[PDB]
Amino acid sequence: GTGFNKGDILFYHREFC
Amino acid sequence: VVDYRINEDEFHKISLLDCDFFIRKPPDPDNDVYDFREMYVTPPDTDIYSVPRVLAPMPQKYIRCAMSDYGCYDVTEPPIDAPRDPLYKSEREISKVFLTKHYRNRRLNDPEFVLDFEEIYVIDSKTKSITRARVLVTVPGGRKRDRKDDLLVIRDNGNSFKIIHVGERDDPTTVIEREEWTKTREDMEKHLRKLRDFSVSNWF
Amino acid sequence: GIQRRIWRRRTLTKKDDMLPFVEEQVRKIKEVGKVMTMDIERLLLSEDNRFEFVNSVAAEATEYVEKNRDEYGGTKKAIFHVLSNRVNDLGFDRPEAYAESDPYKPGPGYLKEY
Amino acid sequence: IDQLELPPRIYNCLKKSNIHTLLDLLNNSQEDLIKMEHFHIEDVKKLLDILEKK
Amino acid sequence: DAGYLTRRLVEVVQHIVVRRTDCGTIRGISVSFIQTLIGRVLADDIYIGSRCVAFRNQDLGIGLVNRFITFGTQSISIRTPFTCRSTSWICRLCYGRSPTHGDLVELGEAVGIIAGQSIGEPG
Amino acid sequence: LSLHRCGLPREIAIELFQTFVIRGLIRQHLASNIGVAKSQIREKKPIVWEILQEVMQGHPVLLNLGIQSFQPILVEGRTICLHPLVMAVHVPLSLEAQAEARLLMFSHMNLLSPAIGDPISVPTQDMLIGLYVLTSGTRRGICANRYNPCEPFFCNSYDAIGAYRQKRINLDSPLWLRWQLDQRVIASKEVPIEVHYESFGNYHEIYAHYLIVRSVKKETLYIYIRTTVGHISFYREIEEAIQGFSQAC
Amino acid sequence: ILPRQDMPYLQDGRPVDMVFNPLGVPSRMNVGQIFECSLGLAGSLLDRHYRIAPFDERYEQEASRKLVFSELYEASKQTANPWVFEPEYPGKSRIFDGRTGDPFEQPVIIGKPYILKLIMEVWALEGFGVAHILQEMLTPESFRLLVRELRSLALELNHFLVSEKNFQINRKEV
Amino acid sequence: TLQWKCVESRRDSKRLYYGRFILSPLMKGQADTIGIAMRRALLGEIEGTCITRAKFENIPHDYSNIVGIQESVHEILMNLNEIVLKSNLYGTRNALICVQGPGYITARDIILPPSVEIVDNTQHIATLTEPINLCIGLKIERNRGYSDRSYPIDAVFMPVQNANHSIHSYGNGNEKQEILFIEIWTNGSLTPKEALHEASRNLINLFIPFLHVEEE
Amino acid sequence: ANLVFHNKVIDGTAIKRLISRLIDHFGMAYTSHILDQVKTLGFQQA
Amino acid sequence: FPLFQLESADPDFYKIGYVRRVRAYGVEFKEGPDGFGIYASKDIEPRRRARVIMEIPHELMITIRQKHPWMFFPDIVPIGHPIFDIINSTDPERDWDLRLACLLLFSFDREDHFWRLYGDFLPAADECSSLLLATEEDLAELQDPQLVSTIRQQQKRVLEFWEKNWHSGVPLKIKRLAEDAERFIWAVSIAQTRCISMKTRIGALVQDLNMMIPYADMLNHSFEPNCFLHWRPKDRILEVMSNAGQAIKKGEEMTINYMPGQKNNMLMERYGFSTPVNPWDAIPFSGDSRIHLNSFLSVFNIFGLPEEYYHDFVDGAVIAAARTLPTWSDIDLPPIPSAERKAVKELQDECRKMLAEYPTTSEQDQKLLDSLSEARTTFATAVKYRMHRKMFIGKIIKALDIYQERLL
Ligand SMILES: Nc1ncnc2c1ncn2[C@@H]1O[C@H](CSCC[C@H](N)C(=O)O)[C@@H](O)[C@H]1O
Ligand SMILES: [Zn+2]
């Protein structure tokens, strides 16, 4: 039944602008 | 059996339960003219033609006839194999076909159109035969009468034909109840016959 | 084929012989919950094995309770929410968790009596 | 609608359709009113103008 | 007496579960009545002349069985619990259609216990 | 009761669902904690029964095809109410157990017995006589007429049923019904008893149970069925059941 | 339990107190209750009690039928209650539905009888395949206690789990 | 206080009106008595208007079919039996159908007596092929449900097609309270709300006579 | 719905056959509702 | 306030299916000069799973096994009928369309069969775009000798089958199916253009079928379809399912992929149509000049593996250009801009050399199609085919120009 078959880059690297 | 295969568009094709009946069709706009000199009969949906049995003299010249079929409904409940298989199946089984001559060969749209019930031809599926019906006329007037007043009554598996006046028409309830009364009356007496005091008893 | 554009509309050009007092019954069907019964059978037509369907529904229901604990156990049952969501995923419309209420209740404290 | 200066033929059509208040008339579209018998497109502008003027 | 028989019947087949789709058996049971054929899965093709009217591994419905009666179908080979390649389990095709669900029996069904109940209960 | 429902008394339901009633009281802040939630249940505070109805809805229970799953509803009284086609009560706790109860053990996906595939819930006893009396048609032959004979017409089935409600006809009095569907009447496969053939082209075919009007000039085909309101009522009940379920789903 | 206006009522207007299923009699073949109820009705209307020794048929054929029908007729005649004895169907009478006022179609037997007041499951779950329901209804103390009793017979019952990933054997704490 | 309200209304077609109504709060046992009495009043005590006789003029030869008319005489009678009417007539009046020739004869073509109105103008009567003149005299009557070459028409007087009632019971402790629902289906000759009012008035008129006194 | 029109009598074996055909054609959810309606009709007429 | 504010198909088209358990959800059948189509009657909002668009019962289909032996599902041919002998005499590999055509003509002759009604909504002999109906003059407008020879062999095979099996001595029940060769050719044209091949499970039997499916043969083809077909074995219903998570706007056409990975010449041979945005069309280059495959894909934002290219101007033609252009790739070696310009210039010259092979141009063909007034359906199909190929070659020249400049 139901028991069958076992049931961060790109940050701090931006343009200074 | 005949050696050839006919051209079926020169014939009326009449389909019954056990045969296809072919009668030659002279060209006509209403397609209701019959040439009975050439007729064939075949097993259903087949092109192997043979001469049908003829049990009565057939018309020699062209005649105009109205066709109606005679039979029953086979309403069954077939087994349900596939999903959504139908709960019922309703088919028509035709055992006889009636060909009723138009009086004086008048057309359907003729204002003086009436049927000539004295000349009716019957096709039987069981025997693959064609014959003329024996008709009993009870209307007063003889051969010269108002054909607009007569009614044809068909009974006994399409074997008894009676022409009555339209004022003698039976109610459909009366027809059904007559058959039931006759059958139950005989069955009741058969049931009561084995009682040993039957011979000294009354019906009431 | 191409004529100028004018074209032949396709029609049946053939005969097909195959071509009101149930309000109380319809409203009772919804009241007793028979609608979900048909939905369950509808979902099981798309399932090869009904035992893995039961397991999958329970697995999805467990996820609902972990995500939002306080919203389930009363008027909204997690298993009913799963079934209604799966019917809506097929493109049909059902109320959320099949939850319905009596609009003719005469105020608080009153229980409908069977 | 009794307090709007509608022509009597328009008034009878709205009452025949059980349109009684101003809000009932507003919720009806312009196609619905044409579906009513004896109320046509030529009657929409004169009815709208009365509601435009109101 | 009915309960004691039911307990022994369940015990002898309690372990039988539908565990495979197809055991891949080649043998079948030959049959030459309608109720003993509905739901069976065919083990071989059936021909009427040169026309195959039913294919191998096709389940037998009421329409197919009536066709075998109408025409000259002398022998039909079906897959039964007697043909499966195991005694610790059975496959879907050797069991056939489920009575309670209309389709082929599903994987994981405890058909042994169902068989035990279906015989013990009418005792 | 519906086939999938059962009725539980308050005294039995509150014990079976006490853990859910306590949680419902705490969740909706009607009780501060576990200890307070018990006192309100003890003291029969009326807010308890409102919560009990909420938590019981959508929560099936097992009743011990000896054991089945039903959706419980609160009923008046002190007894357990079961539908006529059917003591231990088990409440599934885990969602895995609740899924199995609703999706595998309910009384509508087990309509066929595994032995041969027969239906389980066939009407019996008083249900069966009611159908038998309903579909026992009109008296016939010598039981209908004292003497050898050498009925109303209804446009639709609703007029026939309406005439029956107004005591104009009896349940087994014969009538003719105008039929505007195909010929789907189960009857003996028999040729007409009588054919009445008018000289203008119309002919009436009188069968044992229906009348068919046809013509050789037109394509008309009119069907009138000789039946009773009992047969009409039985046909309508099944048809409206199918139509009602389709509209609701 | 119904209000008196919902009960079926007789041709004298009195509603009945109890309604029994008539299908229980032919299967159980206890016709004596039919005799008693009819005679009880006659006695109440005639202000009589009856004490009848069993097997009254020793006097004559259909002795009970003669006693009951004759007393029913006497009750009907003396009290001017023709419904009590119907020549067409003795012992039965047409009664009315309290809800609608329409008569019931067939005549119904009525009377006044004397009524007293009185003082595999695992297999089914396995057949359904409800494995988690079965686990809940079983729960382990049943097996841990079994191990100790087997230990009293110098037998050890160890439960080992073999991992399908790394094939390592784990002895469960039992 | 005891009040009534309409909770559901619908008009499926010109001859299919549905309405559901509520009456609350009622004391125990009252809703059943009201529902039983109202249902009986709705089904047979409300007067409807129907065609009861038809008479084909021009001496149509008393046959089962008429030249130029597709339908037989019986089919015309069946179609006339299905025409829904409303009126305030006292006694009996005559209507008339006089159609020149080819086309569709519908209820729109009936010439009505003063108080009589037609509900569905599109209801079919007869199809005329030939340009013959058809003249049918009709007999119109207003009757309760429970009540010369002219063909009778067995009309069933039921402007209310169906009616049902159900009761809901509510309680808070010892205090009980029941709610009455009434469902009404009409054929369009009357609204469900109007049928509710006429059934109540007809019931009241039935019980007023018990309160009558006599002059001395 | 293309239900056949029975017109003679419905006994125990006739209703059992009809239910089995309804199950095979409409499914168990439809037939379960049909059973409830037929059950109610039988009780009312009895 | 509310007071102050392609033709629909024959209504009986959907009704004849609807009374036989055909269901359509949120779509409508619309008819135009180019034929039938299925369009979303409303905004089909995305869901977590595929939405059911249409449900077609199995009993309304005409199906035959792809592989021998020939069995029909549902079985409609009576035992002993001569039509089976005609079906059984076919080539198992090549004559699948002949087998379906025989079943189709047989189905039209049956009174109770659904395709007796549904056949009236099939395109006629002068409306079907199949090249089996194309005249020799229509094939002259293809400008493709390989495709023309393929069609001529198809027409020869179909005609010879009719002449062999519909001679004078055959029974009348066979003659009335295909009284003339054109009737049988039309049936084969319907079979080729409308057959749907799927793997289905019926009961316990899993098999490949060639299927004539009503209301699903009205879905048009797209190489980026918004719908797909799904067989539901339990109730024997074909489902048309919209892609999961994909929003479909009101009026948008519902499409399926008839032939994944197939070129326009294959679409023309089978279905008698072509698309200018076919992502599998190929062009014969010499290979002397090659561009950088990685750069070309990134310039036009074409991602995924070569067999599953997709776009995040760019359409199926640019994807086809990526697969058909001569390309080089050296893991992560960058391309020299001046060497890539020589390749782009030489590839454009070879593209113009092939456009100069056609007597007319793409826009001249487009205006010819607008000027037509008495043209056969296949003639316009033949012109659209050669015009689409010219549009594809022209798209490559534009794509190379854009790529050459975006490489700076
Ligand atoms: N994307 C597409 N572009 C042009 N024609 C197409 C197309 N998809 C399908 N078709 C046409 O539709 C046919 C497949 S059957 C699809 C329905 C068809 N339009 C009809 O009205 O019956 C093919 O023969 C093809 O000519
Ligand atoms: Zn096996």
Side-chain angles (χ1 to χ4, degrees), chain C residues 2 5 9-10 15 38 43 61 67 81 99 105 110-112:
Chain C
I2 289 195
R5 298 191 49 171
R9 278 72 167 175
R10 307 175 192 168
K15 217 53 60 65
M38 187 58 178
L43 295 177
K67 204 207 317 167
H81 194 192
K105 189 189 299 92
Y110 280 91
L111 297 189
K112 190 178 180 304

Side-chain angles (χ1 to χ4, degrees), chain C residues 20-21 23-24 27 102 104-106 108-113, chain H residues 10 18 20 168-172 175-177 179 181 183 185:
Chain C
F21 309 100
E23 280 97 349
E24 214 293 312
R27 128 166 41 88
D102 190 297
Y104 320 104
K105 189 189 299 92
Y110 280 91
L111 297 189
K112 190 178 180 304
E113 302 172 349
Chain H
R10 181 159 18 92
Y18 171 80
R20 199 189 186 199
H168 294 9
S169 300
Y170 297 86
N172 49 344
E175 175 182 357
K176 291 302 174 301
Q177 171 176 148
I179 296 182
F181 292 93
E183 281 169 296
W185 292 263

Side-chain angles (χ1 to χ4, degrees), chain B residues 69-73 75 88 90 92 108 115 117 147 152-155 169 173 176 178 180-181 184, chain F residues 140-142 145 149 151 176 182-184 186 190-192 194-195 197-199 204 207 212 214 217:
Chain B
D69 50 71
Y70 186 84
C72 52
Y73 288 85
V75 176
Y88 69 94
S90 181
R92 182 113 171 97
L108 288 180
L115 291 173
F117 289 141
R147 304 270 188 164
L152 177 72
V153 176
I154 306 175
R155 299 183 116 263
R169 194 170 191 167
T173 295
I176 294 175
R178 282 172 182 166
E180 296 177 352
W181 207 94
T184 55
Chain F
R140 299 183 179 274
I142 61 175
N145 299 283
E151 294 170 355
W176 292 97
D182 61 322
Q183 168 55 242
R184 58 175 70 176
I186 286 292
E190 290 175 334
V191 300
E194 203 155 311
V195 173
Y197 206 152
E198 302 181 14
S199 63
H204 293 14
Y207 296 83
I212 300 166
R214 291 193 290 164
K217 297 176 64 62

